[PDB]
Every structure is written in structure tokens, then in C-alpha cells.
Design a binder for this molecule. Structure first.
Ligand SMILES: CCCCCCCCCCCCC/C=C/[C@@H](O)[C@H](CO[C@@H]1O[C@H](CO)[C@H](O)[C@H](OS(=O)(=O)O)[C@H]1O)NC(=O)CCCCCCCCCCCCCCCCC
Ligand SMILES: *[C@@H]1O[C@H](CO)[C@@H](O[C@@H]2O[C@H](CO)[C@@H](O)[C@H](O)[C@H]2NC(C)=O)[C@H](O)[C@H]1NC(C)=O
Ligand SMILES: *[C@@H]1O[C@H](CO)[C@@H](O[C@@H]2O[C@H](CO)[C@@H](O)[C@H](O)[C@H]2NC(C)=O)[C@H](O)[C@H]1NC(C)=O
Ligand SMILES: *[C@H]1O[C@H](CO[C@@H]2O[C@@H](C)[C@@H](O)[C@@H](O)[C@@H]2O)[C@@H](O)[C@H](O)[C@H]1NC(C)=O
Ligand SMILES: C[C@@H]1O[C@@H](O)[C@@H](O)[C@H](O)[C@@H]1O
Lengths: 274, 99
């Protein structure tokens, strides 16, 4: 499920206090930021430019220059009639998706206070049913400019498809890289009298797909509990896999890690009770 | 809606006393975005701590990674302190190499 999206986070805290952040993301990986001070797009990687010319980037910088300020200002002025109460937050994500190497869809959705509010589909803004009357009112206001909705539509259905294909191609050495994990064993918090929790840590792997199991020889231990895959600053991933056992059955346990980068040589670590 | 933050602390490498490592605090699933996050050494704020740009998940909830280099010792205690409007007091989660 490969996607690219631009996010907007606009926070409105007070009468005269507010923040606006715009960034570009290839799934979990940040590839762009909007720099309002200099009014420019910041390329975080040399390949963030994709296959777009300098001229197309300038044009896109202008579009973001004008739209960021008009949207920020617009929401602050419409807040009273829309009944947006301070403090509030608006979030937007827009972009496109790839299924099996083909652009499958484009999207554009907006949230108010952490909940779906409106979305843009089929060349117009549509209210989320449970958001109520204020969402219908918001769309009434957004759908009043066909010119501006046609620009939005061109960017979702023509600019974005072109861009993501160019971005994955240009970034191919970074995104197709394989980094081997290291692993280690420790104790976890004790489940109670006469029992232990065993923990296998798997750190520094890329890409994200991984397999980790507690084992007794060739027998997978079904009590194995996988934690969330957690990020590290260097772009790699971390995972803990735990197992609870009676103290007297900790002998002969091991942790097996399989990853794409290991070229068939699984990491195997043995729990030492001696 | 408001969502309370999940907080998870971990090192990049196996702990080894006297050798340089990275301490991480991943704060996720919160709303609104306004949050205070500190890494602590012996209860006391660590000064040069980096964090990722603010982002959010598909469910609209926010997430950040905070990290710094550090050197584990027998005596030194490390932790992540989080304040958010959903919490009545700041939450502290300790780094423990054997938990
Ligand atoms: C850092 C990023 C670099 C990435 C480069 C890659 C490019 C690939 C294409 C990505 C497409 C991203 C999704 C696009 C969503 C757009 O719908 C959307 C445009 O919406 C805006 O709506 C306004 C009216 O509601 C205005 O019509 C405004 O136009 S203006 O003349 O008044 O300035 C209009 O711009 N965004 C963009 O074009 C990108 C810039 C986004 C900046 C954040 C704003 C997001 C829109 C929020 C909704 C608008 C609130 C408006 C309040 C009412 C005002 C009347
Ligand atoms: C998306 O919008 C289009 C354009 O208005 C819709 O397509 C039209 O639908 C009417 C009635 O079903 C037809 O008479 C027209 O021939 C259609 N126009 C075109 C260009 O083919 C479409 O129904 C909408 N789709 C959804 C699911 O929202
Ligand atoms: C960047 O790469 C995209 C993806 O290949 C280019 O768009 C394709 O161009 C071919 C032929 O040149 C067309 O037949 C396809 O229909 C295009 N696919 C898509 C998704 O639009 C694009 O030309 C390249 N450069 C720019 C400026 O986008
Ligand atoms: C409005 O809020 C201003 C900023 O407040 C500080 O930062 C924000 C993000 C919150 O985290 C808040 O709790 C912090 O105190 C204040 O400086 C200012 O006094 C406020 N003004 C008004 C109109 O009340
Ligand atoms: C990066 C681009 O992606 C798409 C193809 O149509 C082009 O030929 C090129 O591979």
C-alpha cells in the first residue's frame, strides 16, 4: 500500500495565537517540508525532487505560497459562523495510492478536532454525515469556487500520480535498501509468582516486514506476543516479542528472527538459565 | 475528540555500561497536538533532545519520536516525561533494560 501525501496541521489556540505546518510524506518517511519563512519547499533528500523540473517546482511553490495563507486566514475568519471554538485543530491529508505498481486512487480529507469533517471527491467537497450541520455549511462555502476546485482536482488526479511514480524511481536506492537487524534477549515484567516474561528485542532493520517467534526447537511458541513496530531516528525499525512462562520451563527456549536482509541466515538466540 | 498519549521508551542497541547508545521515546495516539515531552536523566531534564516533525496516523491521532545519545551506567536512571491535556498529572515512563 504505497502512498504519498501532503499533510496540513493548523492549530488555533487563542484570539491571536496559531500555528501552521505543511509536510510531504512517503508513507512513514518524510520527504518534504514547507518553509513559510522563505516561502519555499524544502527537499529533505536529493531525490525528493522526483522527475519534476525546477520550473514545475517553482509553480508548485507559488501554489502552496498562496493556498497556505488563504486557507489559514480563511478558517480563522469563518470560525465564528462554523462554530469552531477555541482551541481547535484542523488536519488535512491529500495524496494518492499505488496498488501493484499502478496508481489506484487519490484522496483529500479534512478533520476538525480529530474527527472526519469533510472530504473532496468527484470534483466537490462532501460533508461527513456525523459531523452535522457545520460540515454541510463548510462544504457550501468550499464548493462556491469551481475554478479553485478544478485546480485541486488537477493536482489530485494528474500532478500526484505523476509525482509519486517519479519519486519512487528517483529514491529507489534508498527505498530498496536492506539493513540487517541485531537482536538481544532480556527479562520483561514478571506476570506473577512462579512465572517470567522473556523478551526478544529486534533493532535496526529495514524494510519493515519482519518475522520473530519464540521457539522450543522447531516448535513455534504460540504465546509469543509482538509489540508495535517502533521507529528509530536513523530510519530503521524496532520490535519486541515477549513470552510468558512458568519459571521451570524457561530451559531450551530460543528467539528466531527472519528478515529479507539476512539472505537466509536467521538470527537465533538462546535463553540462558545456568 | 481527545485521545490520551501512549508512551514507549527503548534503546537502539543492547545496554552496555560505559558505551554510547541512543535512548528513544515514542509518543503516539494523542489529540490535540499540543504536548510537552522531556527525556530525563536522574529525574532532571536532558537538554539537547531531538524530535521528528509532528505527524499523524490514519485515525487523525498524532505521533512524535524523541531521542538523544546517552551512555547507560549502573547508577544512572533514564525516563520519558509527558504532559498533555488528557493527563491529570505528567506521566513518567522509565527506561529499564531488564523490563
Ligand atoms: C510540502 C509539500 C510538497 C509536495 C509536492 C508534491 C505535489 C503533489 C500534489 C499533492 C496534492 C496535495 C493535496 C491538495 C489539496 C488541495 O485541495 C488544497 C487546496 O485547498 C484550498 O482551499 C481554499 C478554500 O477553502 C482555497 O480555495 C484555496 O485557494 S485560494 O485561491 O484561496 O488560495 C485552496 O488552495 N491544497 C493544496 O493545493 C496544497 C496546499 C495546501 C495548504 C493547506 C490547505 C489545505 C486545504 C484546506 C481547506 C481550505 C480551508 C479554506 C477556508 C475557507 C476559505 C474560503
Ligand atoms: C461524479 O460526477 C459525475 C459528473 O457529474 C457523475 O457523472 C454523471 O452522472 C449523470 C447521472 O448518473 C450522467 O447523466 C452523466 O452522463 C455523468 N457524466 C459523465 C461525465 O459521465 C457521476 O455520477 C459522479 N460519481 C459519483 C459516484 O459520485
Ligand atoms: C515523471 O514520471 C511520470 C511517470 O512515468 C511520467 O508520466 C508518464 O508518462 C508516460 C509516457 O511518457 C505516459 O504515457 C503515462 O501515461 C504517464 N503516467 C502517468 C502516471 O501520468 C511523467 O511524464 C514524468 N515527468 C513529469 C514532469 O511528471
Ligand atoms: C494564548 O496561548 C498562548 C500560548 O500558550 C502556550 O502555548 C500553547 C501552545 C499552549 O501549550 C499553552 O498552554 C501554553 O501556555 C499564551 O502565551 C497566551 O497567554 C494566550 N493568550 C490568551 C488570549 O489567553
Ligand atoms: C519513473 C517513470 O515511471 C513511469 C514510467 O512510465 C516512466 O517510463 C518512468 O519509469
Amino acid at each position: 500500500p504505497l502512498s504519498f501525501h501532503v499533510i496540513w496541521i493548523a492549530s488555533f489556540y487563542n484570539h491571536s495565537w496559531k500555528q501552521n505546518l505543511v509536510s510531504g510524506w512517503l508513507s512513514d518517511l518524510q520527504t518534504h517540508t514547507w518553509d513559510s519563512n522563505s516561502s519555499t519547499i524544502v527537499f529533505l533528500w536529493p531525490w525528493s525532487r522526483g522527475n519534476f523540473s525546477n520550473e514545475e517546482w517553482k509553480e508548485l511553490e507559488t501554489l502552496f505560497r498562496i493556498r497556505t495563507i488563504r486557507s489559514f486566514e480563511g478558517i480563522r475568519r469563518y470560525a465564528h459562523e462554523l462554530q469552531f471554538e477555541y482551541p481547535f485543530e484542523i488536519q488535512v491529508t491529500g495524496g494518492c495510492e499505488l496498488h501493484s505498481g499502478k496508481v489506484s486512487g487519490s484522496f483529500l480529507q479534512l478533520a476538525y478536532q480529530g474527527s472526519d469533517f469533510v472530504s473532496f471527491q468527484n470534483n466537490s467537497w462532501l460533508p461527513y454525515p456525523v459531523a452535522g450541520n457545520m460540515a454541510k455549511h463548510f462544504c457550501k462555502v468550499l464548493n462556491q469556487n469551481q475554478h479553485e476546485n478544478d485546480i485541486t482536482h488537477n493536482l489530485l488526479s494528474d500532478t500526484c500520480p505523476r509525482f509519486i511514480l517519479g519519486l519512487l524511481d528517483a529514491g529507489k536506492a534508498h527505498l530498496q535498501r536492506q539493513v540487517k537487524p541485531e537482536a538481544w534477549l532480556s527479562h520483561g515484567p514478571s506476570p506473577g509468582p512462579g512465572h517470567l516474561q522473556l523478551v526478544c528485542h529486534v533493532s535496526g532493520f529495514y524494510p519493515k516486514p519482519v518475522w520473530v517467534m519464540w521457539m522450543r526447537g522447531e516448535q513455534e511458541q504460540q504465546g509469543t506476543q509482538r509489540g508495535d513496530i517502533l521507529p528509530s531516528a536513523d530510519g530503521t525499525w524496532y520490535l519486541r516479542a515477549t513470552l510468558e512462562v512458568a519459571a521451570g520451563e524457561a530451559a531450551d527456549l530460543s528467539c528466531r528472527v527472519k528478515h529479507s536482509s539476512l539472505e537466509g541466515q536467521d538470527i537465533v538466540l538462546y535463553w540462558h538459565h545456568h | 475528540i481527545q485521545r490520551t498519549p501512549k508512551i514507549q521508551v527503548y534503546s537502539r542497541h543492547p545496554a552496555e555500561n560505559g558505551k554510547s547508545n541512543f535512548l528513544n521515546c515514542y509518543v503516539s495516539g494523542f489529540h490535540p497536538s499540543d504536548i510537552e515531552v522531556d527525556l530525563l536523566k536522574n529525574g532532571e531534564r536532558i537538554e539537547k533532545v531531538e524530535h521528528s516533525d509532528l505527524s499523524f496516523s490514519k485515525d487523525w491521532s498524532f505521533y512524535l519520536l524523541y531521542y538523544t545519545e546517552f551512555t547507560p551506567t549502573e547508577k544512572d536512571e533514564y525516563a520519558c516525561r509527558v504532559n498533555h491535556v488528557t493527563l491529570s498529572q505528567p506521566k513518567i515512563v522509565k527506561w529499564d533494560r531488564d523490563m
